[PDB]
Amino acid sequence: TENILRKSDEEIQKEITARVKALESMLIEQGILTTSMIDRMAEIYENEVGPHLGAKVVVKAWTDPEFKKRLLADGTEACKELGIGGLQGEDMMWVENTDEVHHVVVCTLCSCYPWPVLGLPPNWFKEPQYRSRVVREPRQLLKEEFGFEVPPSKEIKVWDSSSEMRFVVLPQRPAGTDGWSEEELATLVTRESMIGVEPAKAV
């Protein structure tokens, strides 16, 4: 949005770049930061940890009623069955979309997000526009921002993640997918469907 006080994006990036490199140089000289430490964190969250992990959990729950029961009872323990867990998903609780209930997750105070199953959050989730509005008019936001029309008679539960509990949405399995393989089903599971701002992919 226009702010007549604001520098250009190029000038902002230039200044941030110098401040970050300066702080980086000081922590390196203190011996507590290294360039290899930086490269490892980036490799993990660019390539090793992302929403393909949560997609595996969702498709197992869709295809294994006993696993789905364990997932809803103890999300962290059930995900550990698949070797999935860790930082910022120490305490996961999965919530089931149904014909009567739709779930959507937000962190209005501080960007909370279940990294082990979704990776790092996209920028819109961290930003004040989504965070301010979804607790106040979730039905309208879903329709206007995500093209997702939740009928007025259907309950929307908005989970504001104010603690270290991490809420993950188990979306409903799309129609027309009877007998699909787990690989085919995974193509329908998006990070958006596990936040609750979209259903799983149709068709």
Binding site: L5, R6, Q13, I16, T17, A18, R19, V20, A22, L23, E24, S25, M26, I28, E29, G31, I32, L33, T34, T35, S36, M37, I38, R40, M41, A42, Y45, G85, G86, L87, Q88, E90, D91, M93, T108, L109, L120, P122, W124, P128, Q129, Y130, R131, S132, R133, V135, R136, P138, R139, E145, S153, E155, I156, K157, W159, D160, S162, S163, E164, M165
Partner: protein, 228 residues
């Protein structure tokens, strides 16, 4: 604290900016800012609750419009000064140096493998905030409770939009690190944790969806009984 970061229910922040696709890191400085968290955590700059409190003390106009990972830089510097681990005058001299010499190398340093081992263990082992305590939970599923009207100036998880409101206990999770103490340098002081459900009408009045609720996490001191 009652800062602008407490945005739940705020109007006028504008439409969502959601590019049809985006990289995890939008610039190399973002990778650096992100990876500094385990380094500064291990070195004792701050824990997680203190980290968030540092962001909450930003200039509010800067918070609202600066790139997300710049918030992280601000809180590292905040706690580096707080703990005496960062000399501001030296930081400002190094900033001017890298302004004028953007391609100058970083200092010579050893790639200590134990720092990378630390990263791997944290990522895949986690840093659980659950704690065991002496007492059973005071509340249980189905209890009707009211949220505190307290307005501490220090760190807390007391969004203004839920203060004073009445809701129903949905789940008891066990006890966890308490942000109102941990974020203010007072220690973990663990408290039982609950999810509490507030109807949209309770929160927003008649402008509230008659078929919507907000589920909000409440540590035990936050809530007091209305009806069992």
């Amino acid at each position: 604290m009652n800062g602008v970061y407490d945005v739940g229910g705020t109007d006028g922040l504008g439409p969502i900016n959601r590019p049809a696709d985006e990289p995890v890191f939008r610039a190399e400085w973002e990778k650096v800012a992100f990876a500094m968290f385990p380094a500064t955590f291990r070195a004792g700059f701050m824990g997680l609750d203190e980290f968030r409190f540092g962001i909450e003390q930003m200039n509010p106009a800067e918070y609202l419009e600066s790139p997300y990972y710049w918030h992280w830089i601000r809180t590292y510097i905040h706690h580096g000064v707080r703990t005496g681990k960062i000399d501001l005058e030296e930081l400002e001299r190094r900033t001017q140096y890298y302004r004028e010499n953007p391609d100058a190398p970083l200092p010579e340093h050893e790639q200590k493998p134990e720092l990378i081992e630390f990263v791997n263990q944290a990522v895949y082992g986690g840093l659980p905030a659950s704690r065991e305590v002496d007492r059973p939970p005071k509340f249980k599923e189905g209890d009707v409770v009211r949220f505190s009207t307290a307005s501490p100036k220090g760190h807390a998880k007391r969004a203004r939009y839920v203060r004073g409101k009445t809701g129903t206990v949905v789940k008891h999770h066990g006890a966890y690190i308490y942000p109102d103490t941990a974020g203010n340098g007072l220690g973990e002081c663990p408290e039982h944790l609950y999810t509490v459900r507030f109807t949209a009408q309770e929160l927003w009045g008649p402008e509230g969806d008659p078929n919507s609720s907000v589920y909000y996490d409440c540590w035990e001191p936050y809530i007091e009984l209305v009806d069992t």
